[PDB]
Amino acid sequence: GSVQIVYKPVDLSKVTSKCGSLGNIHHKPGGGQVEVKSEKLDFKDRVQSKIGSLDNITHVPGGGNKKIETHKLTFRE
Amino acid sequence: GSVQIVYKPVDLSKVTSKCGSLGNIHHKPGGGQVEVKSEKLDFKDRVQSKIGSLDNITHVPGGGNKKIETHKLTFRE
Amino acid sequence: GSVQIVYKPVDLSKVTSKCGSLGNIHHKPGGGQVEVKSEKLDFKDRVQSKIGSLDNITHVPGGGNKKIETHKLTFRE
Amino acid sequence: GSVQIVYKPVDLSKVTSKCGSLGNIHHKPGGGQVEVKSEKLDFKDRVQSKIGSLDNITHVPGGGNKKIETHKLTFRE
Amino acid sequence: GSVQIVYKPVDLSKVTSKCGSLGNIHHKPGGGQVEVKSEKLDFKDRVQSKIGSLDNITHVPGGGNKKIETHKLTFRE
Amino acid sequence: GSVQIVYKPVDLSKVTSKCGSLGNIHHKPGGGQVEVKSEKLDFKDRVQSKIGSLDNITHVPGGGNKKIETHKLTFRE
Amino acid sequence: GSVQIVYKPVDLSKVTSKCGSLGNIHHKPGGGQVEVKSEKLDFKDRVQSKIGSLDNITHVPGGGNKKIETHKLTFRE
């Protein structure tokens, strides 16, 4: 016997923004307080962690568009 | 016998925004207080965690559009 | 027998922004306080961590667009 | 005519405490938020004020006894 | 004519406490929020005020006894 | 005529404390946030004020006793 | 005529403390945030003020006793 696979996906797509101005943004936090008492840790595989954080962000992109996109073709006898 | 697969998806799509201004934004938190007492940890596989966080964000994109998109073709004998 | 795979995905896509100005941004945090008491650590494989952080960011790209994109073709006898 | 005033108050009093221990005291407040918009002020005579306070106290005297005591003798022709 | 005043009050009094221990005290408030909009103020004589307060106290005296005590003798022709 | 005033108040009083220990005291506040918008001020005579405070205290005297005491004799023709 | 004033107040008083130890005291504040917008000030006579404070204290006297005491004799023809 025989197999034939043809895989020809097309994408002419568009992701876009326009904006006149971003302007007055104020991020102004009064500071907190944290504590943790985690005695014994054992992390193995692909782990991510935070422990005891007190972190502030201000993220102001003039356009933060994103296009996440995956293909997979798999064949097994 | 024989098999024939043809896979030709098309996308001419569009994701869009327009905006005149973003303007006056104020993020202004009075600070809290956290505690945790987690004695013994054991994380194994693909784990994500936070423990004891006190985190503030301000995220103001002039267009935050997004197009998440996956294909998969799988064949097994 | 025999197998034939043809894989010819096309992408003419576009990710875009326009912006008139970003302008007045103020990030101004009053400082907190952290503590951690994690006695014994054992990290093995692909681990990421933070422990006891107090970190501030201000991230203001004049366009922060991104296009994440993966292909995979796998064949097994 | 004539006047005679004699004024001889006596006090042998006592104010007292005993205590074995004061011990474990924890004062641990998560932080609030205040605002005031008082446009025009005019304070004249013997005034005390606070405006817009956010104040924490912890007052632990090993004996906080007090004896407030006033005399006044006044004579007018 | 003539007047004779004799004023000889006596006090042998006592105010007292005994206590074995004060011990475990926890004062632990989650933080509120206040606002005031008082446009025009005019305080004159012996005034006390607070306006817009958010204040926490913890007052743990090992004996907080008190003896407030006033005399007054007044004579007028 | 004639006047005779004699003024001989006596005080053998005592204010006292004993204490075994003061010990474990923890004062640990997560930080708040204040604002005030008081445009025009005019303070004249004997005034005290605070405006816009965010103040923490910890006051732990090993005996904080106090004896406030006033005399006044006044004579007018 | 004639006047005779005799003024011989006596005080054999005592204010006292004993204490075994003061010991473990921890004052540990996460930091807040203040603002004030007071355009025009005019202070005249005996005024005290604070404006825009963010102040922490830790006051631990091994005995903080105090004896405040005033006399006044006044005579007017």
Side-chain angles (χ1 to χ4, degrees):
Chain A
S2 60
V3 179
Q4 299 182 306
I5 298 178
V6 177
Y7 178 108
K8 295 202 177 179
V10 177
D11 180 316
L12 314 191
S13 64
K14 59 185 290 187
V15 189
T16 304
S17 179
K18 297 174 62 171
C19 182
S21 58
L22 298 200
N24 307 309
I25 292 159
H26 300 250
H27 175 107
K28 193 163 166 183
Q33 183 146 24
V34 176
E35 177 165 17
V36 178
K37 294 198 182 186
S38 181
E39 299 189 350
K40 181 172 177 178
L41 276 52
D42 179 347
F43 305 164
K44 202 165 179 177
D45 183 7
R46 288 184 182 243
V47 176
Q48 298 180 221
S49 83
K50 298 171 61 172
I51 305 178
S53 203
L54 176 43
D55 49 312
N56 306 294
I57 297 177
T58 289
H59 178 199
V60 184
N65 309 304
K66 63 186 73 175
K67 188 189 201 301
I68 316 306
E69 174 159 25
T70 82
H71 294 249
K72 173 151 63 180
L73 171 52
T74 165
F75 181 107
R76 298 197 180 188
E77 294 188 346
Chain B
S2 60
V3 179
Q4 299 182 306
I5 298 178
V6 177
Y7 178 108
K8 295 202 177 179
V10 177
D11 180 316
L12 314 191
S13 64
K14 59 185 290 187
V15 189
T16 304
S17 179
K18 297 174 62 171
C19 182
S21 58
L22 298 200
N24 307 309
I25 292 159
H26 300 250
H27 175 107
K28 193 163 166 183
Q33 183 146 24
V34 176
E35 177 165 17
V36 178
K37 294 198 182 186
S38 181
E39 299 189 350
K40 181 172 177 178
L41 276 52
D42 179 347
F43 305 164
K44 202 165 179 177
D45 183 7
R46 288 184 182 243
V47 176
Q48 298 180 221
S49 83
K50 298 171 61 172
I51 305 178
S53 203
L54 176 43
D55 49 312
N56 306 294
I57 297 177
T58 289
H59 178 199
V60 184
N65 309 304
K66 63 186 73 175
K67 188 189 201 301
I68 316 306
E69 174 159 25
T70 82
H71 294 249
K72 173 151 63 180
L73 171 52
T74 165
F75 181 107
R76 298 197 180 188
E77 294 188 346
Chain C
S2 60
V3 179
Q4 299 182 306
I5 298 178
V6 177
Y7 178 108
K8 295 202 177 179
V10 177
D11 180 316
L12 314 191
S13 64
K14 59 185 290 187
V15 189
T16 304
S17 179
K18 297 174 62 171
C19 182
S21 58
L22 298 200
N24 307 309
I25 292 159
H26 300 250
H27 175 107
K28 193 163 166 183
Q33 183 146 24
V34 176
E35 177 165 17
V36 178
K37 294 198 182 186
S38 181
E39 299 189 350
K40 181 172 177 178
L41 276 52
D42 179 347
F43 305 164
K44 202 165 179 177
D45 183 7
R46 288 184 182 243
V47 176
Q48 298 180 221
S49 83
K50 298 171 61 172
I51 305 178
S53 203
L54 176 43
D55 49 312
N56 306 294
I57 297 177
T58 289
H59 178 199
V60 184
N65 309 304
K66 63 186 73 175
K67 188 189 201 301
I68 316 306
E69 174 159 25
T70 82
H71 294 249
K72 173 151 63 180
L73 171 52
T74 165
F75 181 107
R76 298 197 180 188
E77 294 188 346
Chain D
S2 60
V3 179
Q4 299 182 306
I5 298 178
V6 176
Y7 178 108
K8 295 202 177 178
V10 177
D11 180 316
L12 314 191
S13 64
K14 59 185 290 187
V15 189
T16 304
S17 179
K18 297 174 62 171
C19 182
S21 58
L22 298 200
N24 307 309
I25 292 159
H26 300 250
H27 175 107
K28 193 163 166 183
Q33 183 146 24
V34 176
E35 177 165 17
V36 178
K37 294 198 182 186
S38 181
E39 299 189 350
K40 181 172 177 178
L41 276 52
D42 179 347
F43 305 164
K44 202 165 179 177
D45 183 7
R46 289 184 182 243
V47 176
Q48 298 180 221
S49 83
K50 298 171 61 172
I51 305 178
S53 203
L54 176 43
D55 49 312
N56 306 294
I57 297 177
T58 289
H59 178 199
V60 184
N65 309 304
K66 63 186 73 175
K67 188 189 201 301
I68 316 306
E69 174 159 25
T70 82
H71 294 249
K72 173 151 63 180
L73 171 52
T74 165
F75 181 107
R76 298 197 180 188
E77 294 188 346
Chain E
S2 60
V3 179
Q4 299 182 306
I5 298 178
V6 177
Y7 178 108
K8 295 202 177 178
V10 177
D11 180 316
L12 314 191
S13 64
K14 59 185 290 187
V15 189
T16 304
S17 179
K18 297 174 62 171
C19 182
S21 58
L22 298 200
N24 307 308
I25 292 159
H26 300 250
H27 175 107
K28 193 163 166 183
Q33 183 146 24
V34 176
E35 177 165 17
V36 178
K37 294 198 182 186
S38 181
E39 299 189 350
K40 181 172 177 178
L41 276 52
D42 179 347
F43 305 164
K44 202 165 179 177
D45 183 7
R46 288 184 182 243
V47 176
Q48 298 180 221
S49 83
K50 298 171 61 172
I51 305 178
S53 203
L54 176 43
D55 49 312
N56 306 294
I57 297 177
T58 289
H59 178 199
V60 184
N65 309 304
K66 63 186 73 175
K67 188 189 201 301
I68 316 306
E69 174 159 25
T70 82
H71 294 249
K72 173 151 63 180
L73 171 52
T74 165
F75 181 107
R76 298 197 180 188
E77 294 188 346
Chain F
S2 60
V3 179
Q4 299 182 306
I5 298 178
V6 177
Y7 178 108
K8 295 202 177 179
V10 177
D11 180 316
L12 314 191
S13 64
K14 59 185 290 187
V15 189
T16 304
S17 179
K18 297 174 62 171
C19 182
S21 58
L22 298 200
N24 307 309
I25 292 159
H26 300 250
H27 175 107
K28 193 163 166 183
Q33 183 146 24
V34 176
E35 177 165 17
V36 178
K37 294 198 182 186
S38 181
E39 299 189 350
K40 181 172 177 178
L41 276 52
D42 179 347
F43 305 164
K44 202 165 179 177
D45 183 7
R46 288 184 182 243
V47 176
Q48 298 180 221
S49 83
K50 298 171 61 172
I51 305 178
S53 203
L54 176 43
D55 49 312
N56 306 294
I57 297 177
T58 289
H59 178 199
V60 184
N65 309 304
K66 63 186 73 175
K67 188 189 201 301
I68 316 306
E69 174 159 25
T70 82
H71 294 249
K72 173 151 63 180
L73 171 52
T74 165
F75 181 107
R76 298 197 180 188
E77 294 188 346
Chain G
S2 60
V3 179
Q4 299 182 306
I5 298 178
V6 177
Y7 178 108
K8 295 202 177 178
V10 177
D11 180 316
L12 314 191
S13 64
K14 59 185 290 187
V15 189
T16 304
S17 179
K18 297 174 62 171
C19 182
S21 58
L22 298 200
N24 307 309
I25 292 159
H26 300 250
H27 175 107
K28 193 163 166 183
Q33 183 146 24
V34 176
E35 177 165 17
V36 178
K37 294 198 182 186
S38 181
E39 299 189 350
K40 181 172 177 178
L41 276 52
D42 179 347
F43 305 164
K44 202 165 179 177
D45 183 7
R46 288 184 182 243
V47 176
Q48 298 180 221
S49 83
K50 298 171 61 172
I51 305 178
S53 203
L54 176 43
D55 49 312
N56 306 294
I57 297 177
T58 289
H59 178 199
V60 184
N65 309 304
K66 63 186 73 175
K67 188 189 201 301
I68 316 306
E69 174 159 25
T70 82
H71 294 249
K72 173 151 63 180
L73 171 52
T74 165
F75 181 107
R76 298 197 180 188
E77 294 188 346

